[PDB]
């Protein structure tokens, strides 16, 4: 939900997409650690038993019965790591019957959010701009370069569809613990889905070089239960 100092792993998941991304990453890292242990063990044992070898076996050049094996074996380990990757790829793309759309438009160094479903009693579209709290006006306890003045509030256990675009340059709507990363280019509208499984607040940032205010461009998502979402939306 937030980066921690000296961390070395993912942020804690909140969507099924991110919890699948974590499992695919660990499944890949399994066989990656097998291959790393193999080649590092060979690279250790060879230079520790043949640095002190005074006769070089200079007639070993072909090895036919094992070149085919170390061509074939990387291919089957590629197949094994590629089997769940295709399943996740073709699972994360379907945006089937969402209960909410939210547009996120990246301007130069603010984001502009727009709930556009008219489920309100007001019946009008809800938009607001969320700027970074500057460093001199941070009241005490606030997270530097992460906190904003307004927030994007989303209900939990709801299929949400984020439609992402930009206005002037290319930005990136990215939240890692939700596991959404989507380029905001000024010509087109992309979409991602999410289902938030737990309430809380999740931070993200513009992951595309927007210019001189690129570091000062954060995303803050408060996921609440659906009553509290409704009473938030009744104002703005």
């Amino acid at each position: 939900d937030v980066p921690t100092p000296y961390a070395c792993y993912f942020q804690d998941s909140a969507t099924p997409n991110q919890e699948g991304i974590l499992e695919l990453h660990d499944n890949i890292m399994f066989y990656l650690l097998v291959i790393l242990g193999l080649v590092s063990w060979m690279l250790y044992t060879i230079v520790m038993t043949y640095s002190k070898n005074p006769i070089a076996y200079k007639y070993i050049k072909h090895g036919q019965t094992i070149e085919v094996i170390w061509t074939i074996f990387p291919a089957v380990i590629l197949l094994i790591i590629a089997f769940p990757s295709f399943i996740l790829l073709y699972l994360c793309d379907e945006v089937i019957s969402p209960a909410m759309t939210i547009k996120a438009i990246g301007y130069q160094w603010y984001w502009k959010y727009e709930y556009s479903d008219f489920i309100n009693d007001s019946g009008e579209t809800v938009e607001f701009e969320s700027y970074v709290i500057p460093d001199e006006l941070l009241e005490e306890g606030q997270l530097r370069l992460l906190d904003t003045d307004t927030s994007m509030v989303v209900p939990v256990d709801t299929h949400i569809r984020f439609v992402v675009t930009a206005a002037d340059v290319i930005h990136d709507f990215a939240i890692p613990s939700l596991g959404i990363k989507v380029d905001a280019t000024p010509g087109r509208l992309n979409q991602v889905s999410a289902l938030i499984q737990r309430e809380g607040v999740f931070y993200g940032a513009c992951s595309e070089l927007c210019g001189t205010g690129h570091a000062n461009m954060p995303i803050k998502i408060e996921a609440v239960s659906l009553p509290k979402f409704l009473e938030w939306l009744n104002e703005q």
Partner: protein, 45 residues
């Protein structure tokens, strides 16, 4: 024939210490940030 000591003994007494040396070199080559985190204040010690 198979003259002399067995090959499992001959190569076990060579390969056993290099396993431990490889373990030490690999853990200092990969787990060297653990030595910084252990002395950092984020561990609260």
């Amino acid at each position: 024939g198979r003259i002399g000591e067995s090959w499992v003994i001959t190569e076990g007494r060579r390969l056993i210490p290099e396993i431990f040396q490889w373990s030490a070199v690999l853990s200092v080559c990969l787990g060297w940030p653990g030595a910084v985190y252990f002395f950092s204040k984020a561990r609260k010690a």
